[PDB]
Structure 1
Amino acid sequence: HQVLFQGFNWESWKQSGGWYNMMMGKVDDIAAAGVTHVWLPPPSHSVSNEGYMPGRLYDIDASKYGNAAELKSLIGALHGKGVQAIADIVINHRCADYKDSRGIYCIFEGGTSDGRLDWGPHMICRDDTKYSDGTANLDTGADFAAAPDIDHLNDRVQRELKEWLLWLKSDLGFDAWRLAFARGYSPEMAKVYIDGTSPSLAVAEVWDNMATGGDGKPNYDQDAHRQNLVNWVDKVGGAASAGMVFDFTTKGILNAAVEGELWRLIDPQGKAPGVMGWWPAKAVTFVDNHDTGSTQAMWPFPSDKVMQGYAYILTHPGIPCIFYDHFFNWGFKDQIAALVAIRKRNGITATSALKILMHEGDAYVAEIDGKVVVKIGSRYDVGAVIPAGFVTSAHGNDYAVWEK
């Protein structure tokens, strides 16, 4: 059994009294709903309030979300209910606290009294010219324009970041990683950090553009998009690695699918069209996150159909990740918990077998492990396609589930 939960949104840092402190009162509800792993925000000092512009990596006390003691308490509480904690790891780039003689911010401070992570421009990818001194290796991946990109090919950088990661586990209690902007460095480099730290899982955020047609809708065939994600997993070690990826292919397709185009939910081979259909054990599915939804709203799930998104990911193969707001602020808490219970009691996992029964514009009906049937769509009657022996168990707006 495995269900992730994003425990923060874009506005979390503003929480009165601290976000971690507030989360202490949500631990029990989250654990009772069947969640096994909670993804927490970048924990270090950051030039930006949300944490995505890390500076002094060891300075947990300077975070806007809360300090080391508060974080350690929240992780301790989570563990007490058998729930793991995933840390958001932002290592593609990093901000330097001080300026050098050139007047450029490229002299770093790790947050401790000794020299750990107290880097200089020699650790900045030489091709990031706005900040480098031209002496480092070239960037192994994409560049982040708003800050110095780190040279992961540097021996000292690799050694110190691994040491830092191991510390997040031993000192704070973290169990796994969420690799932020993973396309910023090569999978070969991600492999160094993953294999060197033994996380329970390392879910990478590889967000690439989804090919569309003349009408602006994503093309039905998204094989190139999911191939890019599967290629990343193969390069980090495949089945022998703790690495996996967020299923953005399923996210982009489902966004379009629920608008009366449910025929998009099956490929020509009869499989799910996202990463879920090719390598389910390595696919972390989701309806929205702090970027796509929340207050950034870069690619929001159709608001009136959010529960169809959950009826889909919670009953299907792949590893589902519930978004904070949807669980607590949308009036869906009971419905979401009911779906997770169905997944759990029926022994459904990331590798459960999927057999799609109907995939028409206004009706998608599928059977999982021969134990659960799920339907989403505006068409009311799908009675004729429900196998003998099944009876409704959970239902709501344009969705229903049957069990044997």
Structure 2
Amino acid sequence: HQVLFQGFNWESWKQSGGWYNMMMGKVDDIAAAGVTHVWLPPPSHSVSNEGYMPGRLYDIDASKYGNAAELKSLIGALHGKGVQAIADIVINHRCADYKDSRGIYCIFEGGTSDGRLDWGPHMICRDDTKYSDGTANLDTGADFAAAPDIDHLNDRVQRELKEWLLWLKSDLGFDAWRLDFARGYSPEMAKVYIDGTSPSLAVAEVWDNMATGGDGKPNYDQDAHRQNLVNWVDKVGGAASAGMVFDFTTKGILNAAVEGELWRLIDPQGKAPGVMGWWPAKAVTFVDNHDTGSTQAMWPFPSDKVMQGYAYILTHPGIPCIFYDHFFNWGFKDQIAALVAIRKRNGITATSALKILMHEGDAYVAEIDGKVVVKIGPRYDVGAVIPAGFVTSAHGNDYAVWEK
């Protein structure tokens, strides 16, 4: 049984009294809902309030979310309920606190007395010409315009980041990682950190644009998109790695599918159209996150159909991730918990078998492990497609789930 929960949103840094402190009162409900892992925000000092422009990595007390003590208390509370903690790891880029003789901000500060993480321009990708000194390797991935991109091919960088990552586990209690902007560096470099820090899991954010057609909707055939994702997993070590990816393919397709086009939810070979259909053990599914939804709303799930999104991911193969807002702010707590309960009760996991029974525009019906049936869509009656012996267990707006 594995179910993730993103425990923060884009406004979390503003929480009066601190986000971690506030989260202490949410721990019990999260655990009671069947969540096994909670994804927490970047914990270190960051030039940006949300934490995605890290500077002094060891300086946890500088975070807007809370200090080391408050974070250790939250992780301990989670652990007390058998729930693991995932840290949002931002290492593609990093902000340098100090200026060098050239007057450029390329002298870094780890946040400790000694020289740990006290890098210089030699650790900045040579092609990030604004900050580099030209002695480094070329960026192994995409660039982040607002800050220096780190040269992960550098031996000291690899050595010290792994040391820092191990410290996050030993000193704070973190169990796993969420790799931010994984397109910023190669999967071979991500492999270095994953293999070297032994996380229970390492879910990477590998987000590529999804091809669309003349009508502005995504193309039905998204194989190229999920191919990129499976390729990343293969290069990170595949089944021999704790690494996995967020299923952005399923996110993109589902966004469009619920708008009267549920026929998009199956490929020509009868499998799920996203990563879930090719490598479910490595696909972390979701309805929305702090980027796609929340205040940024880069690619929001149709708001009136959010529960259809959860009926889908919480019953299907792959590892589902629940978004904080939908559970504690929107009124879907009970409905979401009921779906996770069905998942757990029936022993459904990431590799459970998926048999799609109907995939028409107004109705999608699927059977999982021959033990659970789920239906989403505006078409009310699908009774004719429900196998004998199944009885309705949970239902809501345009969704229903059956069990035996």
Same fold (TM over 0.5): yes
Paired residue secondary structure (1:106)? strand
Q: State the 1:281 CA deviation.
A: 0.3
Partner of 1:205 in structure 2?
A: 205
Structure 2 residue matching 1:400: 3-state secondary structure: strand
Q: Does residue 295 of the first structure (1) align with residue 298 of the second (2)? A: no
Aligned-partner Cα distance in 1 for 2:293–2:285: 15
Please give the alpha-carbon distance, in whole angstroms, between the structure 1 residues aligned to 2:238 and 2:174: 23
Could you tell me how far apart the structure 2 residues matched to 1:166 and 1:121 are?
A: 25
CA deviation profile, 1:143-186 (whole Å, cap 9, x unmatched): 10000000011111010000000000000000000000001111
Between the aligned residues of both structures, percent identity stands at 100
Paired residue secondary structure (2:86)? strand
1:151 aligns with 2:151: yes
Secondary structure of the corresponding residue to residue 341 of structure 1: helix
* Partner deviation per Cα, 1:302-358 (whole Å, 9 max, x = no partner): 000000000000000000000000001110000000000000000000000000000
SS at match of 2:334: helix
1:370 matched residue in structure 2? 370
- Measure, in 2, the Cα distance between the counterparts of 1:137 and 1:336: 47
- The structural deviation recorded for 1:103 is 1.8
1:118 partnered with 2:109? no
Q: Deviations over 1:105-140 (max 9, x none)?
A: 101000000000001101000000011011111111
Show the counterpart of 2:100.
100
Q: CA deviation at 1:104?
A: 1.2
Distance 2:43 2:56 in 1: 10
2:125 match: secondary structure:
coil
> 1:100 Cα shift?
1.5
Distance 1:101 1:318 in 2: 51
Paired position in structure 2 for 1:139: 139
Cα distance between partner residues in 2 of 1:304 and 1:114: 53
Q: Secondary structure at the match of 1:57?
A: coil
Q: How far did residue 215 of structure 1 move?
A: 1.0
Deviations 1:269-322 (A, max 9, x none): 000000000000000000000000000000000000000000000000000000
Structure 1 spans left out of the alignment, 5+ residues: none
Deviations 1:33-59 (Å, cap 9, x if unpaired)? 000000000000000000000000000
1:85-114 deviation digits (Å, cap 9, x = unpaired): 000000000000011122211010000000
After superposition, what is the alpha-carbon deviation per residue over 1:359-400, rounded to whole angstroms, capped at 9, x for unaligned? 000000000001100000000100100111011010000000
How do 1:53-132 residues align onto structure 2 when only pairs under 5 Å count?
53-132=53-132
CA apart distance, 1:205:
0.2
Aligned to 1:273: 273
3-state SS, counterpart of residue 217 of structure 1 = coil
Cα deviation per residue 1:199-222 (whole Å; 9 max; x = unaligned)?
Answer: 000000000000111111000000
CA distance in 2, matches of 1:359, 1:184: 37
**1:339 matched to which residue of 2?**
339
**In structure 2, what is the Cα distance between the partners aligned to 1:35 and 1:102?**
50
Please, which runs of 5 or more residues in structure 2 have no aligned partner? none
Distance (whole Å) between structure 2 residues aligned to residue 371 and residue 44 of structure 1: 44
* Residues 2-39 of structure 1: CA deviation (Å, up to 9, x unaligned): 00000000000000000000000000000000000000
Partners of 1:100 and 1:170 in 2: CA distance? 33
Q: 1:130 and 1:289 mapped to 2: Cα distance?
A: 32
C-alpha distance in 1 between matches for 2:389 and 2:122: 67
- The CA distance in 1 between the partners of 2:362 and 2:356, in whole Å, is 14
Q: Separation in 2 of the partners of 1:138 and 1:280?
A: 33
TM-score w.r.t. structure 2 length? Answer: 1.00
Post-superposition Cα deviations, 1:237-267, rounded to whole Å, max 9, x if no partner, equal 0000000000000000000000000000000
Distance 2:272 2:153 in 1: 37
Q: Answer with 222-231 or 99-108: which moved more.
A: 99-108
Structure 1 vs Structure 2 CA RMSD: 0.4
* TM-score normalised by L of structure 1: 1.00
| Secondary structure of residue in 2 paired with 1:64 | coil
Distance, in Å, in 1 between the alignment partners of 2:370 and 2:135 is 59
**3-state SS, counterpart of residue 249 of structure 2:** helix
Q: Determine the C-alpha separation between the residues in 1 that align with 2:41 and 2:383.
A: 44
Q: Aligned pair 1:34/2:6, yes or no?
A: no
CA distance in structure 1 between the aligned counterparts of 2:12 and 2:378, rounded to whole angstroms: 35
Cα shift at 1:224: 0.2
Rounded to whole Å, the distance in 2 between the matches of 1:274 and 1:153 is 32
**In structure 2, distance between residues paired with 1:128 and 1:401:** 52
Q: Distance in 1 between matches of 2:139 and 2:367?
A: 46
| Structure-1 separation of matches of 2:340 and 2:55 | 38
Q: Partners in 2 of 1:138 and 1:353 — Cα distance? A: 43
Secondary structure of the residue aligned to 1:136 is coil
Runs of 4+ residues deviating >3 angstroms: none
**SS of 2:106 mapped into structure 1:** strand
Matched position secondary structure for 2:177: strand
Counterpart mapping for 1:186-197 below 5 A: 186-197=186-197
